[PDB]
């Protein structure tokens, strides 16, 4: 069970935690200004606001800029979640986590300037193709496993895993982009947050929960990638919650024996039995039969040939993204919610 490989992982994670804590305790703040970027096109939207493709004039580099309206964040009671999002993203460093390059704020908005991931959302490719073959889903799943091992070792819980929040880079690798619900917490937490299809039973049942919710969400992701549909779906969220808590899951007939076995252990209502939550931690997942062909080091090093490479017309191309309604940014002459977002 315990080997030199696990010892090298432990050592790598200890140094990664040293790097994280320095940035966590002393966050980067006010590293650019809105006027340093040319706003091109909206890549996505949320209740949070919008993410736009931008060009940094000084370098000619393209970036994705998230714009959050401070008044809307306050009305939606997302102040603490927004402060968590930026404090965490500026402090993390892993090959499958999008990099935050700059952050700043003005009278009206908060801004996060991140690397632009041009391949589009996994959601877009998954819905268009229908489903991914088991080796295709395994390649993406392996990246999430490593990412969660890294995040959890830093006492971070992710809480928003889904194809809509995973982007495909130029090399066909995953970039986790959405940290709106990420939280640094040592004990248990209670916030009702996430997406209906991805919620662990303990979240629905209003129990104190922990990082085991991310392992249940990985089970949902793997199922959705391999089936083309989620394990729990219905027209209304209440019907989805009834299915999640029931203790019943059905697998397509094309799912391999190893895939169903892994999913039964991830989509496990019983926390004393859920993979990722046992004495052996992440190793119950990494060493599962479905992952036998996975070379964890080669994935981390990005040496594995991706099963799918997105089409790239050139720099600034957004063909891999849907079109969204555009709206001009308005900066008030009066500072809004200054005290609430002082640390941003």
């Amino acid at each position: 069970k315990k080997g030199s490989e696990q010892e090298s992982v432990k050592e790598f994670l200890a140094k990664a935690k040293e790097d994280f804590l320095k940035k966590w305790e002393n966050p980067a703040q006010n590293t650019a200004h809105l006027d340093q970027f040319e706003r091109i096109k909206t890549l996505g939207t949320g209740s949070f606001g919008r993410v736009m493709l931008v060009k940094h004039m000084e370098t000619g580099n393209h970036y994705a800029m998230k714009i959050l309206d401070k008044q809307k964040v306050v009305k939606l009671k997302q102040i603490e979640h927004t402060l968590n999002e930026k404090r965490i993203l500026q402090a993390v460093n892993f090959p499958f986590l999008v990099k935050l390059e700059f952050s700043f704020k003005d009278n009206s908005n908060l801004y996060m300037v991140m690397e632009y991931v041009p391949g589009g959302e996994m959601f877009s490719h998954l819905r268009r193709i229908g489903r991914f073959s088991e080796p295709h889903a395994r390649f993406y799943a392996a990246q999430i496993v490593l990412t969660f091992e890294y995040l959890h070792s830093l006492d971070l819980i992710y809480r928003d895993l889904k194809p809509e929040n995973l982007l495909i880079d130029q090399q066909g690798y995953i970039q986790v982009t959405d940290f709106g619900f990420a939280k640094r917490v040592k004990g248990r937490t209670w916030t009702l947050c996430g997406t209906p299809e991805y919620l662990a039973p303990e979240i629905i049942l209003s129990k104190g929960y922990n990082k085991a919710v991310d392992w249940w969400a990985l089970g949902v992701l793997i199922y959705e990638m391999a089936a083309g549909y989620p394990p729990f779906f219905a027209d209304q969220p209440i019907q989805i919650y009834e299915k999640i808590v029931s203790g019943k899951v059905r697998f397509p007939s094309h799912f391999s024996s190893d895939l169903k076995d892994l999913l039964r252990n991830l989509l496990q209502v019983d926390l004393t039995k859920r993979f990722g939550n046992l004495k052996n931690g992440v190793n119950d997942i990494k060493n599962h039969k479905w992952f036998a062909t996975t070379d964890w080091i080669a994935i981390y090093q990005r040496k594995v040939e991706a099963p799918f490479i997105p089409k790239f017309k050139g720099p600034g191309d957004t063909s891999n993204f849907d079109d969204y309604e555009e709206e001009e940014i308005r900066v008030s002459i009066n500072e809004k919610c200054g005290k609430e977002f002082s640390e941003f």
Binding site: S47, F181, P196, E197, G228, Y229, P230
Partner: peptide
């Protein structure tokens, strides 16, 4: 089929967080 039921559902588009 389960796929046809999923495709005919109102939850095949981008899903909002709760």
């Amino acid at each position: 089929t389960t796929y046809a039921d999923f495709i005919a559902s109102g939850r095949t588009g981008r899903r909002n967080a709760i």
